[PDB]
Nucleic acid binder design. Structure first.
Ligand SMILES: [Ca+2]
Ligand SMILES: [Mn+2]
Ligand SMILES: [Mn+2]
Ligand SMILES: [Mn+2]
Ligand SMILES: [Mn+2]
Length: 344
DNA sequence: CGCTAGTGAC
DNA sequence: TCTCGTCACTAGCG
């Protein structure tokens, strides 16, 4: 998520209701509803007890969307990006640490305070996601597991004209160049739509309303793919790009301290990190549901060597990616767990 | 004065 | 998804 991007571009925000997209197709970032659902039953989950509160929690929103004549497409995360591997394992070890410190020191030492480190160690496994997938398919709702980060898949679905809007709580979707994003949506169906075309309504934004410059801004302000520089946020980065006239972004990144009148020394690794972050936002591997193949988010431009974009995802055979997308193949063990076929 | 980053609570 | 988010504070930079 981008730090307070929603508040920054408020002028481009529009309070709507889901009824706006009646008789239309909308993709859904199911991970948000999954995470929000894994709270009211977090205890029973971490104890090792079969609970399905999060399932009904997601199906609440699903049936809510169905009640307004909308066709939802639930999208899930798949293989972890090669760049976010170490972060994943780190957060994993942190959750293991909380789980370890919340089993003996809080169950015998401070019994009255056990659900402290017992609720801060939650992980959305593929098993839970699949448990949601079954219940969703049982209602005739289409499901699609992304080959990697669901963000890029949703972005594709929106940019390909397959879906009209993207329902999420993650601010990263805006940086991917989505045309329609519905945030902060409650159980009743009231959310905030951000149309890309209306990005020009933001006076504070300046001439940073183009997809490329907006992307550069989101990356420079800090994101999952790259951490922000010290004393750098949305305003200062936006100012950097707004006061920039150079076609080449690299030189601007080098002169960032010169544009902001700040004593900032640019790290050599930060440049490459920026290049990789941008190439990840641009050419992250997604799954085409129509042509049934594994393609990047956008078409490769002239200034990019596709054989160097390993961090943005690695290619697999179309049949394998097809079995991943359907949810039939386990992400970890790479074996078939289901025999679901969309043509039968 | 504004921005950034870090703290405190639901 | 660096509580998950929200906002007031606020310290501290420039
Ligand atoms: Ca300019
Ligand atoms: Mn993120
Ligand atoms: Mn894979
Ligand atoms: Mn995501
Ligand atoms: Mn994201």
């Amino acid at each position: 998520g981008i730090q307070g991007l929603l508040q920054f571009i408020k002028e481009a925000s529009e309070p709507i209701h889901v009824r706006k997209y009646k008789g239309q197709v909308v993709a859904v970032d199911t991970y948000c509803w999954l995470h929000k659902g894994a709270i009211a039953c977090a205890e029973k989950l971490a104890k090792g007890e079969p609970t399905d509160r999060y399932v009904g929690f997601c199906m609440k929103f699903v049936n809510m969307l169905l009640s307004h004549g909308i066709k939802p497409i639930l999208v899930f995360d798949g293989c972890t990006l090669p760049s976010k591997k170490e972060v994943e394992r780190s957060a994993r070890e942190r959750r293991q640490a909380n789980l370890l410190k919340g089993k003996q020191l809080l169950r015998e030492g401070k019994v009255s305070e056990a659900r402290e480190c017992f609720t801060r160690s939650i992980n959305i496994t593929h098993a839970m996601a699949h448990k949601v997938i079954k219940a969703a398919r049982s209602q005739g709702v289409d499901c699609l597991v992304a080959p990697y980060e669901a963000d890029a898949q949703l972005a594709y679905l929106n940019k390909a004209g397959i879906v009209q809007a993207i329902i999420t709580e993650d601010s990263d979707l805006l940086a991917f160049g989505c045309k329609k994003v519905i945030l902060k949506m409650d159980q009743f169906g009231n959310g905030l739509e951000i149309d890309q075309a209306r990005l020009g309504m933001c006076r504070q934004l300046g001439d940073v309303f183009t997809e490329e410059k907006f992307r550069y801004m989101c990356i420079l302000s800090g994101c999952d793919y790259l951490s922000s520089l010290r004393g750098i946020g949305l305003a200062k980065a936006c100012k950097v790009l707004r006061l920039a006239n150079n076609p080449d972004i690299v030189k601007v990144i080098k002169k960032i301290g010169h544009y902001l009148k700040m004593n900032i020394t640019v790290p050599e690794d930060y440049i490459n990190g920026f290049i990789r972050a941008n190439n990840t936002f641009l050419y992250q591997l997604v799954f085409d549901p129509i042509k049934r193949k594994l393609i990047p988010l956008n078409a490769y431009e002239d200034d990019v060597d596709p054989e160097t974009l390993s961090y943005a995802g690695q290619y697999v055979d179309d049949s394998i990616a097809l079995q991943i997308a359907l949810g039939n193949k386990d992400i970890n063990t790479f074996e078939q767990i289901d025999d679901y076929n969309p043509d039968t």
